[PDB]
């Protein structure tokens, strides 16, 4: 049973803030995965991209640990990608799933042209870097599908992006870097500034001051 120790977890558990988008809006750090499976429960799917057997050398031979790459997300605009290393595989997969939940991010979608229905593709061309890997996402028309290698295909399908031309560069056989670069481009969708976002922002109350009376009565400490 979830007993939260965070102001954000206390507000989430008591149904004071709903719809994770304002947690994103005020850009707060999420430090409990229970928030993420509270809001996005029964829609998150997770899959293991890779288990790699990492090693370090000792005088009594090698010490072999296992690193797990888990990509998570509902298919409607959120992904995270977590990575954890452990002495045994099942622990690594569990920890990678928790870390993937914690690092979840919203995906901006746009139109290739003639903005008719639901948004289906990336809103512009974005590029993520990790190590030597450079992944470039390019807007594609409807019904194109995702034209990619299998790993960014998995990540982009979990993002809810239906149609995307891609391009890569570098040592893409370094699947950790290549997954991280795809995740980087996906997050800089909302990092990007577009003329329809030029309108001046209006500042609403942060959740920490909107429910400060609830937080002083119920969270600390009783």
């Amino acid at each position: 049973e979830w007993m939260p120790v965070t102001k954000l977890g206390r507000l989430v558990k008591d149904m004071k803030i709903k719809s994770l988008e304002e947690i994103y809006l005020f850009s707060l750090p999420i430090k409990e995965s229970e928030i993420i499976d509270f809001f996005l429960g029964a829609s998150l799917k997770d899959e293991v991209l890779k288990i790699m057997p990492v090693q370090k050398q000792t005088r009594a031979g090698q010490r072999t640990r296992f690193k797990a790459f888990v990509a998570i997300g509902d298919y409607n605009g959120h992904v995270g990608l977590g990575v954890k290393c452990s002495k045994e595989v099942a622990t690594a997969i569990r920890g990678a799933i928790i870390l993937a939940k914690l690092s979840i991010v919203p995906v901006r979608r746009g139109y290739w042209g003639n903005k008719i229905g639901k948004p289906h593709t990336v809103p512009c061309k974005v590029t993520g870097r990790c190590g030597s890997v450079l992944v470039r996402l390019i807007p594609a028309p409807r019904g194109t599908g995702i034209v990619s290698a299998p790993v960014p295909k998995k990540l982009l399908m979990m993002a809810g992006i239906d149609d995307c031309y891609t391009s890569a560069r570098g040592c893409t056989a370094t699947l950790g870097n290549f997954a991280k670069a795809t995740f980087d481009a996906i997050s800089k969708t909302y990092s990007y500034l577009t003329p329809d976002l030029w309108k001046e922002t209006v500042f609403t109350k942060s959740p920490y001051q909107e429910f400060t009376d609830h937080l002083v009565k119920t969270h600390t400490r009783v």
């Binding site: 809006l25 005020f26 850009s27 919203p106 901006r108 903005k115 008719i116 948004p119 997050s187």
Partner: protein
């Protein structure tokens, strides 16, 4: 956002920095949002209202958050205009 029929197709509308006018992203944990209290003209007591400024993490890492907040406070009639 704003497909041709007219409705808004966006998860949310992110904040923009009040100094550099850049998007404050969902994983920018160096970016603050600070309210500055107002006082009434006659006795200087807090009257329950405030003005809000958001600074992105890049400005707040340059060291220019101080001067930016001071200029925004000049522009909004906070303290001096002649300081």
């Amino acid at each position: 956002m704003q497909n041709d029929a007219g409705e808004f197709v966006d998860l949310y509308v992110p904040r923009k920095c009040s100094a550099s006018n850049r998007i404050i992203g969902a994983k920018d944990h160096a970016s603050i949002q600070m309210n500055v209290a107002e006082v009434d003209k006659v006795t200087g007591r807090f009257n329950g209202q405030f003005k809000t400024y958001a600074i992105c993490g890049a400005i707040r890492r340059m060291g220019e958050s101080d001067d930016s907040i001071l200029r925004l406070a000049k522009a909004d009639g906070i303290v001096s205009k002649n300081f």
